Every structure is written in C-alpha cells, then in structure tokens.
Design a protein around this ligand. Sequence first.
Ligand code: MG
Ligand code: MG
Ligand code: MG
Ligand code: MG
Ligand code: MG
Ligand code: MG
Ligand code: MG
Ligand code: MG
Ligand code: MG
Ligand code: MG
Ligand code: MG
Ligand code: MG
Ligand code: MG
Ligand code: MG
Ligand code: MG
Ligand code: MG
Ligand code: MG
Ligand code: MG
Ligand code: MG
Ligand code: MG
Ligand code: MG
Ligand code: MG
Ligand code: MG
Ligand code: MG
Ligand code: MG
Ligand code: MG
Ligand code: MG
Ligand code: MG
Ligand code: MG
Ligand code: MG
Ligand code: MG
Ligand code: MG
Ligand code: MG
Ligand code: MG
Ligand code: MG
Ligand code: MG
Ligand code: MG
Ligand code: MG
Ligand code: MG
Ligand code: MG
Ligand code: MG
Ligand code: MG
Ligand code: MG
Ligand code: MG
Ligand code: MG
Ligand code: MG
Ligand code: MG
Ligand code: MG
Ligand code: MG
Ligand code: MG
Ligand code: MG
Ligand code: MG
Ligand code: MG
Ligand code: MG
Ligand code: MG
Ligand code: MG
Ligand code: MG
Ligand code: MG
Ligand code: MG
Ligand code: ZN
Lengths: 60, 18, 155, 23, 97, 97, 206, 127, 83
Amino acid sequence: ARKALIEKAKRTPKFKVRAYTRCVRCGRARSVYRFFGLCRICLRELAHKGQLPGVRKASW
Amino acid sequence: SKKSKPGDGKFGRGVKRG
Amino acid sequence: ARRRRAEVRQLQPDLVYGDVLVTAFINKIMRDGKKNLAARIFYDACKIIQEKTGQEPLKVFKQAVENVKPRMEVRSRRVGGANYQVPMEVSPRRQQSLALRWLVQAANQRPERRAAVRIAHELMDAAEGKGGAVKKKEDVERMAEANRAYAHYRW
Amino acid sequence: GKGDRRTRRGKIWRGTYGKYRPR
Amino acid sequence: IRIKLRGFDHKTLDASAQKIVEAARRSGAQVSGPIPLPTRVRRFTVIRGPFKHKDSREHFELRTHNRLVDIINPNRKTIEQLMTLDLPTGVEIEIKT
Amino acid sequence: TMNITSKQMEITPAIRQHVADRLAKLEKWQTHLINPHIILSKEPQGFVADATINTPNGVLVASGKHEDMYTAINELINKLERQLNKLQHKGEARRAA
Amino acid sequence: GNKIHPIGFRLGITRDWESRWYAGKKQYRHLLLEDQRIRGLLEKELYSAGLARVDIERAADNVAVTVHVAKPGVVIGRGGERIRVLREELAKLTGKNVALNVQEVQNPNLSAPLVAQRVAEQIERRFAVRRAIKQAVQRVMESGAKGAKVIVSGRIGGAEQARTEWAAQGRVPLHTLRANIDYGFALARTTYGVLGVKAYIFLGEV
Amino acid sequence: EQYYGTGRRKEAVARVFLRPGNGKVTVNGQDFNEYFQGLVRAVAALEPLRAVDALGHFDAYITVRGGGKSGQIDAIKLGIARALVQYNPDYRAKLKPLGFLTRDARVVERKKYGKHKARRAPQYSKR
Amino acid sequence: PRSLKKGVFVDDHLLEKVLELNAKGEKRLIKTWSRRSTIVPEMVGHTIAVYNGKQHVPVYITENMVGHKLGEFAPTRTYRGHG
RNA sequence: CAGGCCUUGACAUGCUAGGGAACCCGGGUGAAAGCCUGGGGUGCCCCGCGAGGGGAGCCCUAGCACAGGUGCUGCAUGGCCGUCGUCAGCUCGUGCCGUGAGGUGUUGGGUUAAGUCCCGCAACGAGCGCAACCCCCGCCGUUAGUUGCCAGCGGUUCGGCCGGGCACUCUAACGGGACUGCCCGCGAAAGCGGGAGGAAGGAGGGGACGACGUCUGGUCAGCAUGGCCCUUACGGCCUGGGCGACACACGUGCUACAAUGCCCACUACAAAGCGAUGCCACCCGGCAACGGGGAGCUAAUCGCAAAAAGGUGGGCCCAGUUCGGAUUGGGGUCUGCAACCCGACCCCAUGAAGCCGGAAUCGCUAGUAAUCGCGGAUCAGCCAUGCCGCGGUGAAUACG
Ligand SMILES: [Mg+2]
Ligand SMILES: [Mg+2]
Ligand SMILES: [Mg+2]
Ligand SMILES: [Mg+2]
Ligand SMILES: [Mg+2]
Ligand SMILES: [Mg+2]
Ligand SMILES: [Mg+2]
Ligand SMILES: [Mg+2]
Ligand SMILES: [Mg+2]
Ligand SMILES: [Mg+2]
Ligand SMILES: [Mg+2]
Ligand SMILES: [Mg+2]
Ligand SMILES: [Mg+2]
Ligand SMILES: [Mg+2]
Ligand SMILES: [Mg+2]
Ligand SMILES: [Mg+2]
Ligand SMILES: [Mg+2]
Ligand SMILES: [Mg+2]
Ligand SMILES: [Mg+2]
Ligand SMILES: [Mg+2]
Ligand SMILES: [Mg+2]
Ligand SMILES: [Mg+2]
Ligand SMILES: [Mg+2]
Ligand SMILES: [Mg+2]
Ligand SMILES: [Mg+2]
Ligand SMILES: [Mg+2]
Ligand SMILES: [Mg+2]
Ligand SMILES: [Mg+2]
Ligand SMILES: [Mg+2]
Ligand SMILES: [Mg+2]
Ligand SMILES: [Mg+2]
Ligand SMILES: [Mg+2]
Ligand SMILES: [Mg+2]
Ligand SMILES: [Mg+2]
Ligand SMILES: [Mg+2]
Ligand SMILES: [Mg+2]
Ligand SMILES: [Mg+2]
Ligand SMILES: [Mg+2]
Ligand SMILES: [Mg+2]
Ligand SMILES: [Mg+2]
Ligand SMILES: [Mg+2]
Ligand SMILES: [Mg+2]
Ligand SMILES: [Mg+2]
Ligand SMILES: [Mg+2]
Ligand SMILES: [Mg+2]
Ligand SMILES: [Mg+2]
Ligand SMILES: [Mg+2]
Ligand SMILES: [Mg+2]
Ligand SMILES: [Mg+2]
Ligand SMILES: [Mg+2]
Ligand SMILES: [Mg+2]
Ligand SMILES: [Mg+2]
Ligand SMILES: [Mg+2]
Ligand SMILES: [Mg+2]
Ligand SMILES: [Mg+2]
Ligand SMILES: [Mg+2]
Ligand SMILES: [Mg+2]
Ligand SMILES: [Mg+2]
Ligand SMILES: [Mg+2]
Ligand SMILES: [Zn+2]
C-alpha cells in the first residue's frame, strides 16, 4: 500500500477529520510539516540543495 | 505463503494476506 | 582530573557576615538552587544560636567548624590482595568540605522539626564538642590512628 | 503535588485551570 | 507614508531599505531611517537520518527579517519615482500611510 | 530475570527453555547473572546467538554463529563462560608483589 | 556514514539558494511545489542539454527560471523553437508568467553536477569506473580547478560486492567554509542496480 | 548632576542612575528594599559604592527589565559600578581589584539534541 | 462523554431499522456494525447482532443497559488468561 | 484481522471500438463501499436560414497493453544516518632501505585540545583530517528610532497617556575587539608559569563542522534502485476490529514517599516562540472544564500571557498525614461524522502503593548538576509524563 494512498490522501473525505498531511514529494504519512508540505527527510534533502528559500542550517 | 513477516514456510513469504 | 589540579572556586562573601565560609556552608544547606531559603535557614539558625546561647553566631559557627575538621582520614588503597585503609593527612580544603558536609548532614539527622533549628543546634554542639558531626570527625580520626600501622603506604 | 489535579500545583502541571487554579 | 519590508535575506532586506530610503531622500523631503524590526525565526528540527537514530538531528531555521522605513514628508515627487523602483526577488513591500 | 529475543525469526517456548538450560551453565561460577539477554537471529549462512549479561564483576558480551542454531547457542555459551571465568580470576592474577 | 552536504553547508556563505523568493506561511509550500514541479519538467527535458543549475525567482504571480547549461542551443531550440515550446508547457503548469531564460556555463568541467552526470552516463555506457573516475578528476584539473574529488559507490562493474571508488587531486577542504566547493550528484542506473556518482570541484576560496 | 551605567546580567538589563542624594534607591518605580524584600542576595546590588564609601552620598533611580531578581541584582551591581567610573575614573582602583567593573558572560547554556538538558545526557542500560 | 448540548447519538441507519421493527411488530435479528451507537429506550427488549470485527454478537437489550453503547456488550478482544 | 465489495483497477502513458463530451441534482438497496437506477445542455473549423456530419479540448463502457504491491532480499544497491569519535589520526608523491610483505616520512626530544607548533632526522614535500573562515552569547562604536525605548521639560483622565526626544533599554545589520601583542621569569625554540591593561587572556562560553576508514552497522517501511515474487489478487474500496490485549520480564520516564515540605490568599521578576473557519483582550453565565457574547491583531502594535520556583501572610504539626495522587463510583465539558473498545479536561466522592529503594547502575566539571516554570513542531482533539527549544534560581567536588 502506497500509491493508492498518496491518491486517497488527496481526495476530499466523507468527513473532515480523515484529512491528513502527506509529503507532496515522497508521500510520507509521518513527520509531515505543514509549512513545506514536506516530510523531515525531504525537508532535509531539499534544504541541503538550497531549494527551500531562505531555509538555512541554524547554529546557535 | 503470502505477505511480509513472519514467514509461512514458502520461500520469502510471510503469513499476512491481502 | 587528569591534566592539571582543579582550581578551588572562590565564593563571594555572604552579605550578613562577609564570611567566605558562611557562603560555603549556606551552599551546603541549599537544595535545588533555592539559596534564598538556604541563607534564610542559616541566618535564622544564627537567630536561634544567639537566643539560647548569648554568643555571636559567627563565633560559634566558626568554632563548630574547627571541631568537625578531621585532621586525618583513612583512604583505601589495594595492596596485593587486600584493600588497606591508609591513614592520610587531610588538606584544609577537604577538612572544610567534610566539616561543612557533616554539619548539615548530622544536623538534618536531628529530631527538631524546623531546619534552621537543626542547624542552630548542631552548630551549638559542634562548637561545644557534642553532636553527630563531631562524632563523624572522631570516628574518622580513630580509624586513621588505628591503621597508623599502614602510614608508610601513604602517597 | 504536581500529580494531584485538585491543587493549583497540579493544574500548573497539567496546564489546565478550574476551581483549584482559576483565571 | 509607511514602508514595511519582509524577506529571508537581510543582505537584500537592508539593501532595499537603503534604496527606498534614498529615493524619498532624493525626491524630498524627510524620511525616518530604516529601522530593523525583530526577526521571526521559524526553525525545523529533523532526525538527521531516514530510519532510527532518534538522538541525532539537524537544525534548520527560516529567518523572516523585517525593516520599517518612513516617508516623513511624502511629496508626490517621491511617489512617482518610487512607483518604478528596483526590489530584488526575495523581498516583499507593505506600503501604507 | 532472563529475556530471550527471537529477532526476525520465530522460536518456540521449547527453544526459549533450551536457552535457559544452556545459559544455566554460567551459574557454576556462583555470581549474579544480571538481566541476561539472549538474542537469536538467522543470517544467510548461519544462526547468530548474541548475549549481553552483566555480573557484579563486569559485563559479558559474546556472539556465536553456526549453521546449527543449537551449536551457535553453545559456541555462545562457550565464549560467555571464558569471559565470565576471566572476570572471576583476573583479580587473583596480581596478588604478589 | 557522516559527511555534511557541502552545498547546504555553505548556503548563504559561498553559495546561494537555487530558489530565491520570500513567501509567507500561507503560500510557501504551494510556491515550492511549483519549484519542485518546475524542476520536474525542466530537469527531465533539458537533461540532454546539460542541465547544471536551475534558478527560480518570484515577485508577483510571475516566475523567472534561470537555466545554466553547457548546450544553450539545445534548450533554445531551432532558432527559438524549443525555448518557445517550453515556456508554453511551463506557463501551462505555471499558470502564470513563466519567464524563462538560459545561462551559458562557461567551463562545464568546472561545475560539479556536469562532471557527475558525465561519469554517470559514462558508466551506464559500461566504461571502466576507475578510469572514468581518474579522467573526470583530470579534466576538472586541466580546467584549472584548485582540486577535485569524484566518488562512485555501488556495484562497480556489476561486482556483487558493492564498493566505493574515488580519486581526488589537489585540495578539497570540506570543513572550510570560505572554500568554494561545487558539489553535484548524478545517479547511474544500470542493468544491475543504481550506482551513485558524487563530484567535488574546488574553485577557490574567498 | 547625574551619572549612569548600563548593567547587564543573564537576561537582566539594568539602567542605573546615580544622582547625589541622601541614600534613597528606587528600582522600577518602587524603592529597592521593597522590590527586593526577602532577597538576601540584595545588598550585593549596592556593593560597588561600599568599596568607595559612597553609601549615602548618592541616590539611584534604577529601572530594570529582563531575567530574574538576582540577575537584575547583578545587573544593578554592575551598573552603579559602571556609573561610578564616569563620575570619577580614579575609582578603578577599589572597583577593578574587587572585580566590579567586569561583567560575567555566564549565560544559560543551550539545550542540545540527544540530551535532556544542556549537558545532562539520557540514562541508558549498556547491559 | 459526548456533549449534553449535542443530541444523544444513534447511527440513524440502525435506528431506521429498529423503529419499523417497533411499528410492524418486532422481532427480527438486526445485524449492525454500529458499535458507536447509544442504546436508546426504543431498542429495549430487541436483540441486535453487534459486529466486533470478527462476528455479530447477539445482545438482548434491557432497561438496565440503555445508557450504554452497543460495543460495550460485544467485546473485541478474545482472552482467557495466560497459562 | 474479520466481513461486504471492485477487476484496466485509487493512480500513468497508450491504441481501437459504443455513447456523449465535459458537469451539476438526485432516487433504490446497502453498515459504508458497491451495485441498480432516475434528470437535464459540449464549445470550435465545419454544409449549418436544413435535417443531418464530424474531428477533437473531456466524460463513461467493453478490450488489450499496462498499472498497482509499506510483498522478499540493507547478504545485490544509491541516498541518507548511527558508531568508534572532535578521537589525532589516515594517506600520497618522489627519494631512500628491504629479495619481498613492507619500512622510512608519520619515529625521536620538547610542546599543544590537536600529525598543534619547535627542534632533530634519508629524507623533502603534498593531500585529507586538526585549526581557521560560518552562527549564537560576552564588551564597545557606527547606522537606524516604530509598533521599541523614557534620561530631562510641558502638560496627564492618572495608563510613556499625550506633547516631546532617540539619550538609555532594545531591536538588527555593519564594524571594532584578543594577537601570548606588552612586562617579568624559564626556554635553543615552540611554548609554559606569573603580571598589567582590559568586557573578555591563553581556543573567552556554547554551536555548526566528523579524516581514510570500521561495524557484510542502520534503513528495500520515507525515497530511489538490481533481482525475486503476486495479477478478479500478495493490487484496490469500505465498515468494523487491531496496532491500546496482560500470569509475567527488561528499557526509558513522570510523580512521589514529605516540614529545606504541603495548602490557601495576596504580591513580584524571564526568555524563546506561535497566532485570519488563528491567538483571543474584556463582559456576562456556570464551583469548574467550558459556553455565550464580543474588541484587537495580516501583528516589537493586538493576543496566547499567568511564568513557576521566589516574596508576604496565614493554615497544617511528623501522623501513610492537609504527605502521595493511584484506583474506582457519580456527574459534567469540548473536539470530532463518531470518544464501547479507545480521547483529553473539569467537578463531587474514592484516597492505593509508597517511610527513600537488593544485586547492580546512570548523569553531570559552572551558570553545569539540581530545581522551577514557558514555548514550538506534529496536531480536530489527544493519551507529551516524549521530543526540540527557552529562560528563572543556582551548588558540591576534582588529592590524584
Ligand atoms: Mg513506491
Ligand atoms: Mg487527524
Ligand atoms: Mg501527517
Ligand atoms: Mg490490503
Ligand atoms: Mg550534603
Ligand atoms: Mg555524618
Ligand atoms: Mg562527643
Ligand atoms: Mg495532595
Ligand atoms: Mg531520546
Ligand atoms: Mg524474553
Ligand atoms: Mg518478531
Ligand atoms: Mg518466537
Ligand atoms: Mg535469503
Ligand atoms: Mg541458510
Ligand atoms: Mg552483534
Ligand atoms: Mg565447555
Ligand atoms: Mg580469556
Ligand atoms: Mg541580546
Ligand atoms: Mg529586605
Ligand atoms: Mg536551564
Ligand atoms: Mg539508546
Ligand atoms: Mg549495509
Ligand atoms: Mg535488517
Ligand atoms: Mg550502506
Ligand atoms: Mg614511498
Ligand atoms: Mg629484511
Ligand atoms: Mg628496491
Ligand atoms: Mg611504501
Ligand atoms: Mg601514523
Ligand atoms: Mg606509517
Ligand atoms: Mg613528538
Ligand atoms: Mg582535539
Ligand atoms: Mg599535520
Ligand atoms: Mg620529521
Ligand atoms: Mg543612535
Ligand atoms: Mg596560560
Ligand atoms: Mg573544525
Ligand atoms: Mg547485516
Ligand atoms: Mg523500496
Ligand atoms: Mg527493490
Ligand atoms: Mg534478467
Ligand atoms: Mg479500512
Ligand atoms: Mg504501537
Ligand atoms: Mg517470564
Ligand atoms: Mg514518562
Ligand atoms: Mg524525576
Ligand atoms: Mg498550536
Ligand atoms: Mg513521616
Ligand atoms: Mg491512607
Ligand atoms: Mg502502606
Ligand atoms: Mg491525605
Ligand atoms: Mg466514571
Ligand atoms: Mg476514544
Ligand atoms: Mg527524595
Ligand atoms: Mg536516593
Ligand atoms: Mg553498589
Ligand atoms: Mg519538586
Ligand atoms: Mg514543556
Ligand atoms: Mg498540539
Ligand atoms: Zn518526504
């Protein structure tokens, strides 16, 4: 079970509750950030590529 | 004889069914 | 640790007797960084020890500390197939810490309910020579004399 | 008391309010 | 005559508060110098790897710096020369009054 | 008490109890076998019998491997014995001078 | 496995975001999903061109896609033919002013990802990995880089025992931030699995 | 007529205004002794001017914002120490040997991933 | 539990089925998957076959069991101890 | 997992045939899914003042390709990560030595956090590592002065409120600044001890950064990917159930066993963040969770907000207790389609074990440990006592 569920996530559901984030990039149902539409892996992947605008490795 | 784990005695086949 | 001697921290004096040693002792009363309580207990002790004994608290506190400072302690040191209790001198840095520790420690073994009372009382006895804190100094000191036999294993 | 829902201490801990910690 | 700048780059956020506070500084009269509003850091903390290894992360942040600049004496000689100015890509401008 | 993990594999309460019987040999040394944890696994060319066991004198870590799972358990017991015996008499070794 | 991605390491120091634009919490993802999808068609298409970096700018429902390549003529098309044919399918997806441009890659052998892509196809074509590796490092050096390292990991030559081959001439100081280190990756698919080519080019510090 | 030093402790920042007076001292719109009631750490706030017998020669209108009482107390102590040096720079002696002029940078250390605190590591069972 | 303001919850598809059973005169056996349903006094004295994941458990409903939901009487976990 | 279903299929690129495009409203059964069924109008380029006639923007139906698989193999792989380990190391080039493995260099003496540097040497160099360049904090200057600030003057409803000003705090960008630079002393030197100045002194504190490599480490269930396998099923949809089971055992935690404490009332001081079906000021209703109203804020403006430990005062009086808050009963609240399994919260009642913990064993060297709160992501809600942060108070000890 994956593609049937990357699709089933997209569709408007019988009830609003069933709405759930998936990663637009890889499809991950877990650790999905609202702000990027991305999961933490993809977040890290694109961020290291610099394709997340203004997203920089923080160090304090 | 089918999906993942634990095996069902057939090569590379667990006891989960669809 | 391994590279060099530790540096003994310096402690700013307490703002009620200007004593470096009262600070050290107030720290030893402090649980959970709650120094304000800790100072309150020590000073409130001084309140009491002034009452029940018309002497200057500081005089009695410092006197109690002298009577709890161990001059010798045993320290284990396995030679061959036995751990020998070796009699060794106590550096005054350590004599301080032990007497400070043992004062609090023995104090909080006393039965009276309020902490500042227990400090006030253990300080009154260690100044006079009674008290579980003095006992610990004596018990530690009989040990080192007992094992004087092994003084030559001193390092 | 941080485990006792019926103190202000426990409601600070749960992070809720009520009779024993109002607002 | 407010001008309120946002942007993930401060080298450009400061760059264009400059050029704004140089346009109205030219076309007259007064402008209240570019003030740096406190930044709004949206961090992300991610298990550095794909599978387990919970105890190692990598910190990512997203600064949205903020500059506020004032056109004090408006003077529509400004207004027009501003209507055509050069803001680089990662900057957004909130003009009010 | 004793824990047995059958990793990515399925054993029986008989096999679990066999492990306890074999592990029991370590009891000859008359020392506390604290939370002894035996892992079993099956690689392409043999079973692996892992064991991590702490005693009042240090930890026992060892790994046996063999085509026969029962033999691998023994090779594991052997390694653990030799370590546990070393824990018990390494101290005697420097009694003079 | 350890080493930090040396582009993400220098973002905002020796390198700059491949996609530059503010956007607010309400919009960011949707805009980024474009930049993803935009890089989709483009990296899919302009591959044969020799894609090496894909900038994306935005300002107000319009987007400006810089494209730096070794074959500018491949994207530009027949005198304007493809570069047209793309802005269309782009502004179809963009649904907006999909401004497109093309950038010359002065020396290709000095942009990591190109060297990487080359070694990738060079092994997909079944050439000796080690030789192909040492050559790539050579060409980047002839092109006057201050150092170069290229790294092939996988079933090299189809060997069952996956392996990591690499050559490195000159300096490649990856702990150094002022080091301008161009890194790029390319993923060689073969009949026996994927290999992974990493390329490092040290173009000089600042 | 009136003297100032910036006093900054942990997150405490204190604006001290030495002004010659009878001795009065106000901290954020209420007199010191009433703002540090029951804080025995307090007297250290005024300590720089005891090492220059300036005890009741001055007043101090002090505001303070940030951190906590005893931070703000050390922020204070630094300020009035700072302020006394613009009043009279010959004052470094009997301030600097008593380390009053220097500001400790001891900040809360950062929390680090993989720990329970800054340095407090999580407990494990090696066996 | 559920808010008092909001109404008591029956699935309004099992309830259709039980009302006609009142009207036309009960009883047939009512197979349902509506665990989440409150038992309501219209149900008293019926017998409903409650699905639990594996099987439809007859429950005779009675006055004393009308507060409770229909799952509270067809258990899901099969268990007879350890030994 | 059970049960009811679907068979070009939830999804792609197709090719051909029946309709029509497109789409929106349902109706029947049904738990839902599905299955059956009822309504209505396709633009353009076309012969159209006309039936009729397409071709295609898209619809469905039969087909055939193919799809789909979080099915197996991390012992075929890429990627990324853990680990040794921020450890001081790993090597190369040429020369030299050795028949050869290999050695030398990289060892040695001194020094350093460091293969850090000095000196010596059949070596002389070089690379990856170390360091530095980057970020945070500490001092200072510049540039800025609102939504931030209030030193002085004016008013002031008594609230920086307004006028006023950017001094100060700040805020956020740019600089400066520390270099063993100077003095003493020892040193061949490199450095080492001490001193002055100074916010800071010998890497200022913290971070980011992890060499060749090791663990046939980790991950085919994030993703990618070779190969193996499934094809009305190992694919897919739904309803329910499960992932929350409970004779046991292990790990990690929370809260405790109390008076340095517990309770109540009143009263202080943070920082970092988040916040347009979002944060909610304030008023009212209810003991309350909350509900009803209802202002403000696209937010240095308004809000979450109160920080808590602390401080003042009062209560308890050493009791399994005014410790502890588990368990159970009853009653509510909100989210949500729905809280039986299986949510959180509030209130009334219940008020467990626990009197400081065996063998064993963990952490921490300073603004640390301890202790106290505050925020955030994920998220409707929440099982978070977790995680990542943030500041508050703030130790002990290091012979070796
Ligand atoms: Mg997939
Ligand atoms: Mg949800
Ligand atoms: Mg999600
Ligand atoms: Mg299935
Ligand atoms: Mg103690
Ligand atoms: Mg004692
Ligand atoms: Mg005696
Ligand atoms: Mg209680
Ligand atoms: Mg953890
Ligand atoms: Mg077990
Ligand atoms: Mg298993
Ligand atoms: Mg088993
Ligand atoms: Mg196999
Ligand atoms: Mg085999
Ligand atoms: Mg092992
Ligand atoms: Mg044997
Ligand atoms: Mg041995
Ligand atoms: Mg600051
Ligand atoms: Mg007072
Ligand atoms: Mg802290
Ligand atoms: Mg662990
Ligand atoms: Mg592997
Ligand atoms: Mg595995
Ligand atoms: Mg691998
Ligand atoms: Mg050689
Ligand atoms: Mg030889
Ligand atoms: Mg030779
Ligand atoms: Mg050699
Ligand atoms: Mg070496
Ligand atoms: Mg060597
Ligand atoms: Mg040496
Ligand atoms: Mg080091
Ligand atoms: Mg070196
Ligand atoms: Mg040498
Ligand atoms: Mg200024
Ligand atoms: Mg030094
Ligand atoms: Mg470094
Ligand atoms: Mg393996
Ligand atoms: Mg996969
Ligand atoms: Mg595969
Ligand atoms: Mg084949
Ligand atoms: Mg389902
Ligand atoms: Mg689970
Ligand atoms: Mg058992
Ligand atoms: Mg816990
Ligand atoms: Mg605890
Ligand atoms: Mg939230
Ligand atoms: Mg008791
Ligand atoms: Mg009781
Ligand atoms: Mg009992
Ligand atoms: Mg009680
Ligand atoms: Mg109940
Ligand atoms: Mg529930
Ligand atoms: Mg305790
Ligand atoms: Mg204990
Ligand atoms: Mg012990
Ligand atoms: Mg506590
Ligand atoms: Mg928290
Ligand atoms: Mg939440
Ligand atoms: Zn993802």
